[PDB]
From a paper:
Prokaryotic sodium channels are homotetramers, in which each monomer contains six transmembrane segments and is homologous to a single eukaryotic pseudorepeat. As with the eukaryotic channels, their S1–S4 segments form the voltage sensors, and the S5–S6 segments from each polypeptide chain associate to form an eight‐helix bundle that constitutes the pore. The selectivity filter (SF), which determines the channel's Na+ permeability over other cations, is formed by the close association of the P loops from each of the polypeptide chains.
In this study, we analysed new crystals of the NavMs pore that contain only sodium ions and diffract to higher resolution (2.7 Å), enabling us to identify the sodium binding sites in the SF. The NavMs sodium channel pore protein was purified and crystals grown in the presence of sodium ions. The pores in these crystals are in the open conformation, with the activation gate at the intracellular ends of the transmembrane domains of all four monomers splayed to allow ions to exit the pore, as in Bagnéris et al (2013). The locations of three highly occupied sodium ion sites are seen in the centres of the selectivity filters, with ion B‐factors similar to those of the protein atoms. Densities attributable to partially occupied water molecules are distinct and can also be seen within the SF and at the bottom of the SF/top of the hydrophobic internal cavity close to the local anaesthetic channel blocker binding sites (Bagnéris et al, 2014). The sodium site nearest to the extracellular surface (NaI; top cyan ball in Fig 2A) is located close to the site that had been designated S1 in molecular dynamics studies of the NavMs pore (Ulmschneider et al, 2013). Below that is the site we designate as NaII, which is closest to the carbonyl oxygen of Leu177, and is separated from the NaI site by ~2.8 Å. NaIII corresponds closely to the site denoted S4 in the MD studies and above the proposed SiteIN. It is nearest to the carbonyl oxygen of Thr176; it is separated from NaII by ~5.6 Å. An important finding is that there are no protein atoms within the normal outer limit (3.5 Å) for a sodium ion coordination sphere (the closest is Oγ1 of Ser179 at 3.79 Å from NaI), suggesting that protein–ion interactions are mediated by intermediate water molecules.
Author numbering:
A (entry chain B): 131 to 220
B (entry chain A): 131 to 222
C (entry chain D), D (entry chain C): 130 to 220
The structure:
Protein backbone atom coordinates (compact mmCIF):
# COMPACT_ATOMS: atom_id res chain seq x y z
CA UNK A 1 0.00 0.00 0.00
CA UNK A 2 2.79 2.43 1.03
CA UNK A 3 4.92 1.41 -1.99
CA UNK A 4 1.77 1.46 -4.26
CA UNK A 5 1.10 5.11 -3.19
CA UNK A 6 4.86 5.88 -3.64
CA UNK A 7 4.76 4.43 -7.21
CA UNK A 8 1.61 6.49 -7.99
CA UNK A 9 3.34 9.73 -6.81
CA UNK A 10 6.50 9.03 -8.92
CA UNK A 11 4.35 8.17 -12.02
CA UNK A 12 2.17 11.30 -11.44
CA UNK A 13 5.17 13.67 -11.04
CA UNK A 14 7.07 12.19 -14.07
CA UNK A 15 3.93 12.46 -16.29
CA UNK A 16 3.31 16.10 -15.14
CA UNK A 17 6.96 16.94 -16.00
CA UNK A 18 6.50 15.22 -19.47
CA UNK A 19 3.13 16.99 -20.14
CA UNK A 20 4.55 20.49 -19.20
CA UNK A 21 7.25 19.98 -21.87
CA UNK A 22 4.98 18.48 -24.53
CA UNK A 23 1.82 20.64 -24.31
CA UNK A 24 2.90 23.64 -22.16
CA UNK A 25 3.54 26.10 -25.02
CA UNK A 26 0.45 25.18 -27.12
CA UNK A 27 -1.95 24.56 -24.16
CA UNK A 28 -0.67 26.94 -21.34
CA UNK A 29 -3.99 26.94 -19.41
CA UNK A 30 -3.86 23.15 -18.82
CA UNK A 31 -0.07 22.47 -18.93
CA UNK A 32 1.70 25.92 -18.78
CA UNK A 33 3.65 25.00 -15.61
CA UNK A 34 4.11 21.89 -13.37
CA UNK A 35 1.20 23.00 -11.00
CA UNK A 36 -1.28 23.31 -13.93
CA UNK A 37 -0.08 19.89 -15.32
CA UNK A 38 -0.50 18.09 -11.93
CA UNK A 39 -4.08 19.47 -11.61
CA UNK A 40 -4.99 18.54 -15.27
CA UNK A 41 -3.60 14.97 -14.92
CA UNK A 42 -5.60 14.57 -11.64
CA UNK A 43 -8.76 15.58 -13.65
CA UNK A 44 -7.79 13.17 -16.53
CA UNK A 45 -7.34 10.36 -13.89
CA UNK A 46 -10.92 11.03 -12.56
CA UNK A 47 -12.02 10.71 -16.30
CA UNK A 48 -13.73 14.15 -16.09
CA UNK A 49 -13.98 15.72 -19.61
CA UNK A 50 -10.71 13.90 -20.47
CA UNK A 51 -11.52 13.52 -24.19
CA UNK A 52 -14.05 16.24 -25.16
CA UNK A 53 -12.53 18.88 -22.84
CA UNK A 54 -8.79 18.04 -22.95
CA UNK A 55 -7.35 15.31 -25.32
CA UNK A 56 -9.51 16.01 -28.47
CA UNK A 57 -8.47 19.79 -28.39
CA UNK A 58 -4.81 18.68 -27.75
CA UNK A 59 -4.95 16.10 -30.65
CA UNK A 60 -5.89 18.97 -33.08
CA UNK A 61 -2.30 20.28 -32.59
CA UNK A 62 -0.41 17.07 -31.50
CA UNK A 63 -2.10 14.14 -33.39
CA UNK A 64 -0.31 11.41 -31.38
CA UNK A 65 -1.27 12.86 -27.91
CA UNK A 66 -3.41 9.70 -27.30
CA UNK A 67 -0.06 7.71 -26.99
CA UNK A 68 0.55 9.78 -23.82
CA UNK A 69 -3.01 10.11 -22.36
CA UNK A 70 -4.56 6.63 -23.01
CA UNK A 71 -1.58 4.72 -21.31
CA UNK A 72 -1.67 7.37 -18.50
CA UNK A 73 -5.41 6.64 -17.84
CA UNK A 74 -4.91 2.81 -18.10
CA UNK A 75 -2.01 3.03 -15.58
CA UNK A 76 -3.34 5.55 -12.96
CA UNK A 77 -7.00 4.34 -12.94
CA UNK A 78 -5.79 0.68 -12.42
CA UNK A 79 -3.30 1.78 -9.66
CA UNK A 80 -5.91 3.98 -7.80
CA UNK A 81 -8.43 1.05 -7.87
CA UNK A 82 -5.63 -1.32 -6.63
CA UNK A 83 -4.57 1.18 -3.88
CA UNK A 84 -8.11 1.88 -2.52
CA UNK A 85 -8.91 -1.89 -2.46
CA UNK A 86 -5.50 -2.49 -0.76
CA UNK A 87 -6.33 -0.06 2.11
CA UNK A 88 -9.80 -1.70 2.66
CA UNK A 89 -8.35 -5.30 2.69
CA UNK A 90 -5.41 -4.33 5.02
CA UNK B 1 -21.23 0.54 7.99
CA UNK B 2 -23.54 2.61 10.25
CA UNK B 3 -20.57 4.61 11.62
CA UNK B 4 -19.05 4.87 8.06
CA UNK B 5 -22.36 6.42 6.80
CA UNK B 6 -22.43 8.66 9.94
CA UNK B 7 -18.84 9.86 9.20
CA UNK B 8 -19.81 10.56 5.55
CA UNK B 9 -22.84 12.67 6.65
CA UNK B 10 -20.73 14.73 9.15
CA UNK B 11 -17.96 15.27 6.51
CA UNK B 12 -20.61 16.21 3.86
CA UNK B 13 -22.41 18.70 6.14
CA UNK B 14 -19.18 20.33 7.44
CA UNK B 15 -17.78 20.69 3.86
CA UNK B 16 -21.12 22.22 2.63
CA UNK B 17 -20.98 24.72 5.56
CA UNK B 18 -17.28 25.53 4.61
CA UNK B 19 -18.10 25.87 0.83
CA UNK B 20 -21.15 28.20 1.51
CA UNK B 21 -18.79 30.56 3.39
CA UNK B 22 -15.89 30.36 0.93
CA UNK B 23 -17.66 30.48 -2.49
CA UNK B 24 -21.24 31.57 -1.64
CA UNK B 25 -20.84 35.28 -2.51
CA UNK B 26 -18.79 34.78 -5.72
CA UNK B 27 -20.58 31.59 -6.93
CA UNK B 28 -24.22 31.92 -5.55
CA UNK B 29 -25.73 29.44 -8.11
CA UNK B 30 -23.57 26.55 -6.78
CA UNK B 31 -22.90 27.61 -3.15
CA UNK B 32 -25.32 30.55 -2.37
CA UNK B 33 -26.90 28.67 0.58
CA UNK B 34 -26.37 25.33 2.44
CA UNK B 35 -28.95 23.49 0.15
CA UNK B 36 -27.14 24.58 -3.06
CA UNK B 37 -23.73 23.58 -1.48
CA UNK B 38 -24.98 20.07 -0.44
CA UNK B 39 -26.28 19.46 -4.03
CA UNK B 40 -23.02 20.77 -5.66
CA UNK B 41 -20.78 18.65 -3.36
CA UNK B 42 -22.94 15.57 -4.18
CA UNK B 43 -22.28 16.31 -7.93
CA UNK B 44 -18.50 16.86 -7.22
CA UNK B 45 -18.45 13.49 -5.32
CA UNK B 46 -20.00 11.71 -8.40
CA UNK B 47 -17.10 13.39 -10.40
CA UNK B 48 -19.64 14.92 -12.83
CA UNK B 49 -18.18 18.09 -14.47
CA UNK B 50 -16.22 18.65 -11.20
CA UNK B 51 -13.27 20.40 -12.88
CA UNK B 52 -14.51 21.85 -16.23
CA UNK B 53 -17.94 22.81 -14.86
CA UNK B 54 -17.18 23.77 -11.23
CA UNK B 55 -13.56 23.95 -9.85
CA UNK B 56 -11.80 25.54 -12.94
CA UNK B 57 -14.43 28.46 -12.96
CA UNK B 58 -14.02 28.74 -9.13
CA UNK B 59 -10.15 28.75 -9.39
CA UNK B 60 -10.36 31.86 -11.69
CA UNK B 61 -11.49 33.82 -8.58
CA UNK B 62 -10.08 31.64 -5.69
CA UNK B 63 -6.74 30.19 -7.03
CA UNK B 64 -6.28 27.76 -4.10
CA UNK B 65 -9.82 26.19 -4.35
CA UNK B 66 -8.15 22.83 -5.37
CA UNK B 67 -6.87 22.60 -1.68
CA UNK B 68 -10.57 22.25 -0.72
CA UNK B 69 -12.01 20.20 -3.65
CA UNK B 70 -9.22 17.64 -4.38
CA UNK B 71 -9.03 16.42 -0.66
CA UNK B 72 -12.89 16.44 -0.59
CA UNK B 73 -13.04 14.10 -3.67
CA UNK B 74 -10.20 11.84 -2.36
CA UNK B 75 -12.02 11.51 1.01
CA UNK B 76 -15.72 11.09 -0.06
CA UNK B 77 -15.02 8.88 -3.16
CA UNK B 78 -12.87 6.50 -0.98
CA UNK B 79 -15.52 6.45 1.84
CA UNK B 80 -18.48 5.80 -0.61
CA UNK B 81 -16.51 2.92 -2.23
CA UNK B 82 -15.66 1.57 1.30
CA UNK B 83 -19.33 1.94 2.45
CA UNK B 84 -20.93 0.19 -0.60
CA UNK B 85 -18.37 -2.69 -0.37
CA UNK B 86 -19.05 -2.87 3.41
CA UNK B 87 -22.84 -3.37 2.87
CA UNK B 88 -22.20 -6.15 0.24
CA UNK B 89 -19.67 -8.02 2.51
CA UNK B 90 -21.95 -7.71 5.64
CA UNK B 91 -24.72 -9.45 3.55
CA UNK B 92 -22.70 -12.51 2.33
CA UNK C 1 -25.46 67.93 -32.09
CA UNK C 2 -23.15 64.85 -31.91
CA UNK C 3 -21.63 65.97 -28.55
CA UNK C 4 -25.06 65.97 -26.81
CA UNK C 5 -25.80 62.44 -28.23
CA UNK C 6 -22.38 61.07 -27.00
CA UNK C 7 -23.07 62.64 -23.55
CA UNK C 8 -26.65 61.16 -23.50
CA UNK C 9 -25.19 57.65 -24.14
CA UNK C 10 -22.61 58.15 -21.31
CA UNK C 11 -25.34 59.13 -18.75
CA UNK C 12 -27.61 56.19 -19.92
CA UNK C 13 -24.63 53.76 -19.63
CA UNK C 14 -23.86 55.06 -16.09
CA UNK C 15 -27.53 54.92 -14.84
CA UNK C 16 -28.15 51.46 -16.36
CA UNK C 17 -24.79 50.13 -14.93
CA UNK C 18 -25.58 51.40 -11.37
CA UNK C 19 -29.09 49.82 -11.74
CA UNK C 20 -27.70 46.49 -13.13
CA UNK C 21 -25.14 46.25 -10.26
CA UNK C 22 -27.93 47.03 -7.73
CA UNK C 23 -30.46 44.54 -9.19
CA UNK C 24 -28.28 41.64 -10.43
CA UNK C 25 -24.92 42.06 -8.64
CA UNK C 26 -25.58 39.63 -5.75
CA UNK C 27 -27.02 36.78 -7.89
CA UNK C 28 -24.71 37.28 -10.92
CA UNK C 29 -21.37 38.69 -9.50
CA UNK C 30 -19.27 37.91 -12.66
CA UNK C 31 -21.33 40.11 -14.99
CA UNK C 32 -22.78 42.67 -12.54
CA UNK C 33 -20.80 42.45 -9.26
CA UNK C 34 -19.64 46.14 -9.50
CA UNK C 35 -19.92 49.22 -11.80
CA UNK C 36 -16.84 48.18 -13.94
CA UNK C 37 -18.19 44.63 -14.57
CA UNK C 38 -21.76 45.99 -15.39
CA UNK C 39 -20.41 48.72 -17.78
CA UNK C 40 -18.45 45.93 -19.61
CA UNK C 41 -21.54 43.57 -19.76
CA UNK C 42 -23.95 46.33 -20.93
CA UNK C 43 -21.45 47.24 -23.72
CA UNK C 44 -21.44 43.48 -24.71
CA UNK C 45 -25.30 43.53 -24.63
CA UNK C 46 -25.37 46.66 -26.90
CA UNK C 47 -23.12 44.85 -29.52
CA UNK C 48 -25.83 42.06 -29.31
CA UNK C 49 -23.10 39.48 -28.51
CA UNK C 50 -24.70 36.42 -26.71
CA UNK C 51 -27.04 38.98 -25.04
CA UNK C 52 -29.81 36.37 -24.67
CA UNK C 53 -28.32 32.81 -24.63
CA UNK C 54 -25.26 33.93 -22.62
CA UNK C 55 -26.63 36.69 -20.32
CA UNK C 56 -30.44 37.48 -20.19
CA UNK C 57 -31.83 33.84 -20.25
CA UNK C 58 -29.52 32.81 -17.23
CA UNK C 59 -30.58 36.06 -15.39
CA UNK C 60 -34.35 35.41 -16.07
CA UNK C 61 -34.02 32.00 -14.30
CA UNK C 62 -33.48 34.01 -11.06
CA UNK C 63 -35.15 37.39 -12.01
CA UNK C 64 -38.11 36.53 -14.32
CA UNK C 65 -38.94 40.11 -15.29
CA UNK C 66 -35.30 41.02 -16.19
CA UNK C 67 -36.37 41.33 -19.90
CA UNK C 68 -38.12 44.68 -18.94
CA UNK C 69 -34.63 46.07 -18.19
CA UNK C 70 -32.47 44.58 -21.01
CA UNK C 71 -34.92 44.70 -24.03
CA UNK C 72 -35.61 48.53 -23.63
CA UNK C 73 -31.82 49.07 -23.00
CA UNK C 74 -31.03 47.31 -26.39
CA UNK C 75 -33.79 49.32 -28.16
CA UNK C 76 -32.38 52.58 -26.70
CA UNK C 77 -28.58 51.99 -27.13
CA UNK C 78 -28.68 50.42 -30.65
CA UNK C 79 -30.84 53.44 -31.71
CA UNK C 80 -28.54 56.07 -30.05
CA UNK C 81 -25.38 54.44 -31.60
CA UNK C 82 -27.11 54.36 -35.07
CA UNK C 83 -27.98 58.09 -34.69
CA UNK C 84 -24.44 58.98 -33.38
CA UNK C 85 -22.52 57.13 -36.17
CA UNK C 86 -24.73 58.67 -38.93
CA UNK C 87 -24.35 62.06 -37.15
CA UNK C 88 -20.50 62.00 -37.41
CA UNK C 89 -20.68 61.11 -41.18
CA UNK C 90 -23.10 64.06 -41.92
CA UNK C 91 -21.00 66.58 -39.89
CA UNK D 1 -11.32 59.17 -50.57
CA UNK D 2 -12.30 55.46 -50.27
CA UNK D 3 -8.74 54.27 -51.10
CA UNK D 4 -7.22 56.16 -48.12
CA UNK D 5 -9.93 54.67 -45.78
CA UNK D 6 -9.25 51.06 -47.04
CA UNK D 7 -5.47 51.68 -46.54
CA UNK D 8 -6.09 53.13 -43.01
CA UNK D 9 -8.01 49.95 -42.04
CA UNK D 10 -5.15 47.74 -43.42
CA UNK D 11 -2.47 49.61 -41.34
CA UNK D 12 -4.74 49.50 -38.17
CA UNK D 13 -5.34 45.73 -38.72
CA UNK D 14 -1.55 45.15 -39.09
CA UNK D 15 -0.57 47.24 -35.98
CA UNK D 16 -3.33 45.72 -33.80
CA UNK D 17 -2.41 42.12 -35.00
CA UNK D 18 1.32 42.60 -34.19
CA UNK D 19 0.27 44.05 -30.76
CA UNK D 20 -2.24 41.20 -30.08
CA UNK D 21 0.41 38.54 -30.97
CA UNK D 22 2.95 40.32 -28.70
CA UNK D 23 0.54 40.74 -25.74
CA UNK D 24 -1.63 37.58 -25.87
CA UNK D 25 0.31 35.11 -28.05
CA UNK D 26 2.06 33.18 -25.25
CA UNK D 27 -1.04 32.75 -23.01
CA UNK D 28 -3.58 32.29 -25.86
CA UNK D 29 -1.62 30.61 -28.78
CA UNK D 30 -4.76 29.39 -30.69
CA UNK D 31 -6.18 32.90 -31.27
CA UNK D 32 -3.00 35.05 -31.08
CA UNK D 33 0.04 32.73 -31.46
CA UNK D 34 1.26 34.53 -34.65
CA UNK D 35 0.29 37.36 -37.08
CA UNK D 36 -1.97 35.05 -39.25
CA UNK D 37 -3.95 33.74 -36.24
CA UNK D 38 -4.31 37.33 -34.74
CA UNK D 39 -5.42 38.87 -38.13
CA UNK D 40 -8.12 36.09 -38.30
CA UNK D 41 -9.26 36.70 -34.62
CA UNK D 42 -9.34 40.54 -34.99
CA UNK D 43 -11.50 40.12 -38.15
CA UNK D 44 -13.85 37.83 -36.08
CA UNK D 45 -13.86 40.51 -33.29
CA UNK D 46 -14.77 43.25 -35.83
CA UNK D 47 -17.81 41.15 -37.08
CA UNK D 48 -18.79 41.05 -33.32
CA UNK D 49 -18.92 37.24 -33.43
CA UNK D 50 -18.47 35.76 -29.85
CA UNK D 51 -16.05 38.70 -29.27
CA UNK D 52 -16.81 38.72 -25.51
CA UNK D 53 -18.09 35.27 -24.37
CA UNK D 54 -15.70 33.42 -26.70
CA UNK D 55 -12.56 35.66 -26.79
CA UNK D 56 -12.25 38.77 -24.48
CA UNK D 57 -13.77 37.27 -21.21
CA UNK D 58 -11.32 34.21 -21.36
CA UNK D 59 -8.40 36.65 -22.10
CA UNK D 60 -9.39 39.00 -19.17
CA UNK D 61 -9.07 35.99 -16.77
CA UNK D 62 -5.28 36.17 -17.48
CA UNK D 63 -4.92 39.86 -18.63
CA UNK D 64 -7.53 41.89 -16.65
CA UNK D 65 -6.98 45.15 -18.56
CA UNK D 66 -7.40 43.48 -22.02
CA UNK D 67 -10.72 45.42 -22.46
CA UNK D 68 -8.67 48.64 -23.03
CA UNK D 69 -7.28 46.99 -26.20
CA UNK D 70 -10.41 45.24 -27.65
CA UNK D 71 -13.21 47.78 -26.82
CA UNK D 72 -11.40 50.76 -28.61
CA UNK D 73 -10.49 48.35 -31.51
CA UNK D 74 -14.25 47.48 -31.97
CA UNK D 75 -15.23 51.18 -31.73
CA UNK D 76 -12.59 52.08 -34.36
CA UNK D 77 -13.03 49.20 -36.89
CA UNK D 78 -16.88 49.03 -36.85
CA UNK D 79 -16.85 52.83 -37.47
CA UNK D 80 -14.22 52.68 -40.30
CA UNK D 81 -16.08 49.75 -42.04
CA UNK D 82 -19.43 51.68 -41.75
CA UNK D 83 -17.75 54.78 -43.32
CA UNK D 84 -16.01 52.67 -46.06
CA UNK D 85 -19.14 50.72 -47.13
CA UNK D 86 -21.29 53.94 -47.25
CA UNK D 87 -18.38 55.61 -49.12
CA UNK D 88 -18.44 53.01 -51.97
CA UNK D 89 -22.28 53.40 -52.36
CA UNK D 90 -22.02 57.27 -52.64
CA UNK D 91 -19.09 57.11 -55.16
C1 LIG E 1 -2.68 12.98 -7.28
C2 LIG E 1 -2.02 14.29 -6.87
C3 LIG E 1 -2.82 15.53 -7.26
C4 LIG E 1 -2.12 16.83 -6.95
C5 LIG E 1 -2.79 18.07 -7.52
C6 LIG E 1 -2.01 19.36 -7.26
C7 LIG E 1 -2.60 20.57 -7.93
C8 LIG E 1 -1.86 21.87 -7.70
C9 LIG E 1 -2.50 23.03 -8.46
C10 LIG E 1 -1.83 24.36 -8.22
O1 LIG E 1 -0.87 24.45 -7.47
N1 LIG E 1 -2.33 25.45 -8.85
C11 LIG E 1 -1.74 26.79 -8.67
C12 LIG E 1 -2.32 27.55 -7.50
O2 LIG E 1 -1.62 28.78 -7.28
C13 LIG E 1 -3.52 25.36 -9.70
C14 LIG E 1 -3.26 25.39 -11.20
O3 LIG E 1 -3.80 24.22 -11.81
C15 LIG E 1 -3.80 26.71 -11.77
O4 LIG E 1 -2.72 27.64 -11.85
C16 LIG E 1 -4.51 26.61 -13.12
O5 LIG E 1 -5.53 25.62 -13.13
C17 LIG E 1 -5.14 27.94 -13.57
O6 LIG E 1 -5.55 27.81 -14.93
C18 LIG E 1 -6.33 28.40 -12.68
O7 LIG E 1 -6.55 29.80 -12.73
C1 LIG F 1 -8.65 -0.11 -25.70
C2 LIG F 1 -7.80 0.19 -26.92
C3 LIG F 1 -7.67 1.68 -27.20
C4 LIG F 1 -6.91 1.99 -28.48
C5 LIG F 1 -6.96 3.44 -28.89
C6 LIG F 1 -6.26 3.72 -30.21
C7 LIG F 1 -6.42 5.14 -30.69
C8 LIG F 1 -5.77 5.42 -32.02
C9 LIG F 1 -6.04 6.85 -32.50
C10 LIG F 1 -5.23 7.23 -33.72
O1 LIG F 1 -4.50 6.41 -34.27
N1 LIG F 1 -5.35 8.49 -34.19
C11 LIG F 1 -4.58 8.91 -35.38
C12 LIG F 1 -3.21 9.47 -35.05
O2 LIG F 1 -2.43 9.67 -36.23
C13 LIG F 1 -6.19 9.48 -33.50
C14 LIG F 1 -7.48 9.87 -34.22
O3 LIG F 1 -8.53 10.08 -33.28
C15 LIG F 1 -7.25 10.97 -35.26
O4 LIG F 1 -7.69 10.54 -36.54
C16 LIG F 1 -7.82 12.35 -34.92
O5 LIG F 1 -9.16 12.29 -34.44
C17 LIG F 1 -6.93 13.16 -33.96
O6 LIG F 1 -5.54 13.07 -34.32
C18 LIG F 1 -7.34 14.63 -33.87
O7 LIG F 1 -7.16 15.34 -35.09
C1 LIG G 1 -19.43 53.24 -21.67
C2 LIG G 1 -18.88 52.33 -22.77
C3 LIG G 1 -18.32 50.98 -22.29
C4 LIG G 1 -16.98 51.05 -21.56
C5 LIG G 1 -16.56 49.73 -20.94
C6 LIG G 1 -15.62 49.87 -19.75
C7 LIG G 1 -15.28 48.55 -19.11
C8 LIG G 1 -14.36 48.65 -17.90
C9 LIG G 1 -14.15 47.29 -17.23
C10 LIG G 1 -13.17 47.35 -16.07
O1 LIG G 1 -12.86 48.42 -15.57
N1 LIG G 1 -12.70 46.17 -15.59
C11 LIG G 1 -11.73 46.15 -14.48
C12 LIG G 1 -10.32 45.76 -14.88
O2 LIG G 1 -9.64 46.83 -15.54
C13 LIG G 1 -13.18 44.91 -16.17
C14 LIG G 1 -13.69 43.81 -15.24
O3 LIG G 1 -14.18 44.37 -14.01
C15 LIG G 1 -14.74 42.90 -15.86
O4 LIG G 1 -15.05 43.34 -17.18
C16 LIG G 1 -14.36 41.41 -15.88
O5 LIG G 1 -12.98 41.20 -15.59
C17 LIG G 1 -15.23 40.55 -14.97
O6 LIG G 1 -16.50 40.35 -15.60
C18 LIG G 1 -14.65 39.17 -14.65
O7 LIG G 1 -15.54 38.41 -13.85
C1 LIG H 1 -40.63 43.22 -30.18
C2 LIG H 1 -41.42 42.80 -28.97
C3 LIG H 1 -40.59 42.13 -27.89
C4 LIG H 1 -41.35 41.93 -26.59
C5 LIG H 1 -40.77 40.88 -25.67
C6 LIG H 1 -41.68 40.52 -24.51
C7 LIG H 1 -41.16 39.38 -23.67
C8 LIG H 1 -42.12 38.93 -22.60
C9 LIG H 1 -41.54 37.82 -21.72
C10 LIG H 1 -42.40 37.50 -20.52
O1 LIG H 1 -43.51 38.01 -20.40
N1 LIG H 1 -41.92 36.63 -19.61
C11 LIG H 1 -42.69 36.27 -18.40
C12 LIG H 1 -42.10 36.80 -17.11
O2 LIG H 1 -42.03 38.22 -17.10
C13 LIG H 1 -40.62 35.96 -19.79
C14 LIG H 1 -40.71 34.54 -20.33
O3 LIG H 1 -41.89 34.39 -21.12
C15 LIG H 1 -39.50 34.10 -21.15
O4 LIG H 1 -38.88 35.23 -21.74
C16 LIG H 1 -38.49 33.24 -20.40
O5 LIG H 1 -38.35 33.63 -19.03
C17 LIG H 1 -38.76 31.74 -20.52
O6 LIG H 1 -38.40 31.33 -21.84
C18 LIG H 1 -38.03 30.85 -19.53
O7 LIG H 1 -38.30 29.48 -19.78
NA1 LIG I 1 -17.39 8.75 -14.31
NA1 LIG J 1 -18.93 15.64 -18.78
NA1 LIG K 1 -18.41 13.32 -17.28
NA1 LIG L 1 -23.57 36.42 -32.24
NA1 LIG M 1 -23.00 33.86 -30.58
NA1 LIG N 1 -24.49 40.53 -34.90
Amino acid sequence: VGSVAALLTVVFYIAAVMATNLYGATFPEWFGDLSKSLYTLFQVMTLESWSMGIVRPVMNVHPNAWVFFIPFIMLTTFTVLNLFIGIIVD
